[PDB]
Amino acid sequence: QSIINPDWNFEKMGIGGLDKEFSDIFRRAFASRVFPPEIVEQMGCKHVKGILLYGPPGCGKTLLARQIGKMLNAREPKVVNGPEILNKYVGESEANIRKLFADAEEEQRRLGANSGLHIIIFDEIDAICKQRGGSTGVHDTVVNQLLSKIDGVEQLNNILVIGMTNRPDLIDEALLRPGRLEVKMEIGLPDEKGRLQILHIHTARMRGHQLLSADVDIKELAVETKNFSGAELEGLVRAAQSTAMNRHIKASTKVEVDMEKAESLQVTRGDFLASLENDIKPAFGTNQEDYASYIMNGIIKWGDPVTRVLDDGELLVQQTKNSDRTPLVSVLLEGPPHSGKTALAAKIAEESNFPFIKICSPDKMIGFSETAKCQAMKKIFDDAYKSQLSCVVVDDIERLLDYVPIGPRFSNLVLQALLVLLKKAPPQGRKLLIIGTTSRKDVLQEMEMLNAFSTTIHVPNIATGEQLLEALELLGNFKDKERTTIAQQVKGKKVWIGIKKLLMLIEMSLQMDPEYRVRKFLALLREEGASP
């Protein structure tokens, strides 16, 4: 008298992090299959016949389904590996769909209220069971042939279907109604305790044979890895093992010397800490490569107007991290061309210590049509809702809309997508922060895009001789005599020059012979002069 395996326990299941979801799934889908049959039959109830698991990809959805399958005293589970049923001839997909349920019907007709459970695991239910609408080809027929089997004129009572998908809203609505796939669970990214348990599960075996050094710690690794997804944790452990093993392929077995040195192999903290920086790069985490590409030549301090901007950025970050009545915040950086607004946004973003940071620039969308840009922006904004903190940077706003002064001309659709997105708070609890960057504030003011933003900041140019001299001194060019001559010539008047244009005039002037350098630099600076 048992429907479950006589011997089992959860601690052997190999799953770690998903505790409450498993408890709820058991309560719903297994409460009425483990009570004594007499009471259940007296009640006159019917068992649940569906489960739908959805969430971010790579967090252990397939594993839970396979382990629920290998759980029971049920026969071995069948599998429909996604698009394995499609065919070219007329009326062949339906044969494939109908072939699955044959054994269940046979047993139900042969026995009654006594047969053994049958489990069908359906991978990527989204691939085929799309909305039933125009024609879609084979989609409309397969969906009907499926909906007409789980609950039809004839009654089945010994079946249970599991459906896995990462996008939940593209499944036909009818399918997801009480009576067919009913209980739907979400598996998300794990927090600290989940990472601790996963690392223990994946390191126990090494620990068993003493192969693990005493220097390594697991709590520190759990703390330092944030927004890692399980698969990435396994990858990290494998990378550590491979690095440790390769540490010996050049010392002991390379020279074919006594393996005792090779047999003293032991993975240590060095392997992990040197493998956390050059092998694994999360998909929902900070990526320390772009910031080294945007702030090309550092952030020098040419005067006051840098400190104020940085302080304001810090204040905005601090506000967005510790407030409950204001989850969504925004800010706009603006100024004249060639002033530095993509090298002061990156710094503010990178000095926040948020677990998620992303930059969406127009440089990686050359040739795209409008809908491609819309779906790129929406995809980047989808991720930030799946982490408990974030910062998304929108760079060069005026090149996204495809602006051009003649006309004027621009893309309406991108503007509407942007205006709707700048006023959408994330699901309950989470936070956000958005930074912009533009050079034509007024044209933005015309389109009514300064109502969405909650503040603005101003980045100025070099506007006095002293600041130019300080910038030249810090950059490290020209000598004492040349410095003195430049100071005496340029002190009287005033200058108005950006800070990404000075780095070009310096180079253009540093290409003549030593005698004419200062003269050419002064001529170039004078010619490229103007006033507000």
Binding site: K88, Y89, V90
Partner: peptide
């Protein structure tokens, strides 16, 4: 639109029989 499906037809080969029975039965008799 790309989804183009097809129907099909079949043939046979056939063999010889009808009077071999008579010869076999006559031999046995």
């Amino acid at each position: 639109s790309i989804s183009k499906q097809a129907l099909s037809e079949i043939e046979t080969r056939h063999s010889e029989i009808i009077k071999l029975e008579n010869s076999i039965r006559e031999l046995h008799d």
